Amino acid sequence: AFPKVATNIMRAWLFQHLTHPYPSEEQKKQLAQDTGLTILQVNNWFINARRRIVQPM
Amino acid sequence: RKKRIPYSKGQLRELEREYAANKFITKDKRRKISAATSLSERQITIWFQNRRVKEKKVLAKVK
DNA sequence: GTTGACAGTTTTACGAGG
DNA sequence: CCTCGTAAAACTGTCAAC
Known part of the structure; x- marks a missing residue:
């Protein structure tokens, strides 16, 4: 598991931007900062999130 | 270069x-x-260019 | 029952060269 | 504006490790 705080942050971002859930490169710097995850990890999270959470909506 | 943007399924459906x-x-x-679509004329010129590219390699065919 | 990761693939976006 | 090769952001299929 990722740390739960890193999840919450990205999920809160994800749901805030449901209609276009694609962070800008700058936004990825920031989420990776706040989470302590790497930029790859943030990218993989949103890839997996988009097909695992968004598309069902 | 300014980052690429996946098109909506509504958009793609139109094309x-x-x-x-x-x-x-x-x-x-x-x-x-x-x-x-809310898309630039350029974007769709290029989309069609890239779309034909894809079709030309669905010539496959001997598979 | 989910989840993070990644090799392999598809999708936007450009310039080269015509 | 076309066909082309190229890049690189995002997706697909997959699976051990939760």
């Missing part, structure tokens, strides 16, 4: 709809598509 009618776009339809 293919017209691409199925003919594989090269006219200037009038390019305008109507652009209005319909």
Whole structure:
């Protein structure tokens, strides 16, 4: 598991931007900062999130 | 370069709809598509260019 | 029952060269 | 504006490790 705080942050971002859930490169710097995850990890999270959470909506 | 943007399924659905009618776009339809999709005339010129690329490699065929 | 990861693939976006 | 090769952001299929 990722740390739960890193999840919450990205999920809160994800749901805030449901209609276009694609962070800008700058936004990825920031989420990776706040989470302590790497930029790859943030990218993989949103890839997996988009097909695992968004598309069902 | 300014980061690429995946098109909505509503958008894509439109293109293919017209691409199925003919594989090269006219200037009038390019305008109507652009209005319909909220996409630049350039973006759809390039989309059709890339769409034909894909079809040309579905010539496969001996598989 | 989910989840993070990644090799392999598809999708936007450009310039080269015509 | 076409066909082309190229890049690189995002997706697909997959699976051990939760």
